[PDB]
């Protein structure tokens, strides 16, 4: 049903998913001057050395690279988190033009795209259970700006023509997500939600201050993907981002001064 078009997009989502108008929805604008430096925040622990990628998939609203989350291989911990979070998948949100595409914004600034590394809290056993918990998920968000290419992304971009339409998937093993991380792990963090339906309010957001640079040719290949399945009228998978939602009674904390 739901999508990013005029008739089924973000402004329509609340009808099937009333939590869309809830108290901790995502994404949000990160007002850098209002974010509070919290020296009690531990450093982020990103442990991806044993990551096992499995498949890459066009799911009708994004493309995602899925990982084996049946043991504590690639895990996120520390920072604002209590406990261990298993990497399940990563995916992107991007625009039709370089000046839009990100879901979070920084002082109202939009980036060309945003990378989401989705992790779930091992204390809840499976991701289905985790999405029902206020601290079930931790999503690492990384901004993409257009400039120099990101060499680590290229293996991803090169198989996108094999998953053009909704439903298509491919073997995608031995991909190293460390190749997608910026130098600094400085971050903002706040309690939020999934940014697609069901918009469940189960996410601790960890958004990195430092964007990665990707080339125009790389993001252009994102934009050749299709929302539609094969045999349906071609609608380009572009502008698959939800806009900033009301901050309401939340504080964004920064891990850095
Ligand atoms: C493309 O990713 C997904 O389909 C959803 C949305 C995306 O939310 S966001 N954009 O805030 O990172 C995350 N996942 S998800 O909710 O963790 C989605 O959840 C579970 C369903 O309950 C699992 O089947 C996972 O495969 C997971 O992808
Ligand atoms: Zn996302």
UniProtKB/Swiss-Prot annotation:
Cofactor binding note of this UniProt entry: Zinc. Can also use cobalt(II) with lower efficiency, but not copper(II), nickel(II) and manganese(II).
Coiled-coil residue windows: none
Main location: cytoplasm
Effect recorded for residue 196 to H: Higher affinity for bicarbonate. Enhanced proton transfer capacity
Effect of residue 15 to E: In Jogjakarta
Catalytic activity: hydrogencarbonate + H(+) = CO2 + H2O; urea = cyanamide + H2O
Residues involved in Zn(2+) binding: 91, 93, 116
Consequence when changing residue 61 to A: Reduced CO(2) hydrase activity, rescued by 4-methylimidazole (4-MI). Reduced proton transfer. Enhanced proton transfer. Enhanced proton transfer capacity
Keywords recorded for this protein, A-Z: Acetylation, Cell membrane, Cytoplasm, Disease variant, Lyase, Membrane, Metal-binding, Osteopetrosis, Phosphoprotein, Zinc
A cellular-component GO term for this protein: extracellular exosome
GO biological process: angiotensin-activated signaling pathway; carbon dioxide transport; morphogenesis of an epithelium; neuron cellular homeostasis; positive regulation of cellular pH reduction; positive regulation of dipeptide transmembrane transport; positive regulation of synaptic transmission, GABAergic; regulation of chloride transport
Top EC group: lyase
Note: Target of drugs used in treatments against glaucoma disorder and breast cancer.
Protein's UniProt name: Carbonic anhydrase 2
Species assigned in the record: Homo sapiens (Human)
Gene name of this polypeptide: CA2
């Amino acid at each position: 049903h739901w999508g990013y078009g005029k008739h089924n997009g973000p402004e329509h989502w609340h009808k099937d998913f009333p939590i869309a108008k809830g108290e901790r929805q995502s994404p949000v604008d990160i007002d850098t001057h209002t974010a509070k430096y919290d020296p009690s925040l531990k450093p982020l622990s990103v442990s991806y050395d044993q990551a096992t990628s499995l498949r890459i998939l066009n799911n009708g609203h994004s493309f995602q690279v899925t990982f084996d989350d049946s043991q504590d291989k690639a895990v996120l911990k520390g920072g604002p988190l209590d406990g261990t979070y298993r990497l399940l998948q990563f995916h992107f949100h991007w625009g039709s033009l370089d000046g839009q595409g990100s879901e979070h914004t920084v002082d109202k600034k939009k980036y060309a795209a945003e990378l989401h590394l989705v992790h779930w809290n091992t204390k809840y056993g499976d991701v289905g259970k985790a999405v029902q918990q206020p601290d079930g998920l931790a999503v690492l968000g990384i901004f993409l700006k257009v400039g120099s290419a990101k060499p680590g992304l290229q293996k991803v971009v090169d198989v996108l023509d094999s998953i053009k339409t909704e439903g298509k998937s491919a073997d995608f093993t031995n991909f190293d997500p460390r190749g997608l991380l910026p130098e600094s792990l400085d971050y903002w963090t706040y309690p939020g939600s999934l940014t697609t339906p069901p918009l469940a309010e189960c996410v601790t957001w960890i958004v990195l201050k430092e964007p990665i640079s990707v080339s125009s040719e790389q993001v252009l290949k994102f934009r050749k993907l299709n929302f539609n399945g094969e045999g349906e009228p071609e609608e380009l998978m572009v502008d698959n981002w939800r806009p900033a939602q009301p901050l309401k009674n939340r504080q964004i904390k920064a891990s850095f001064k």
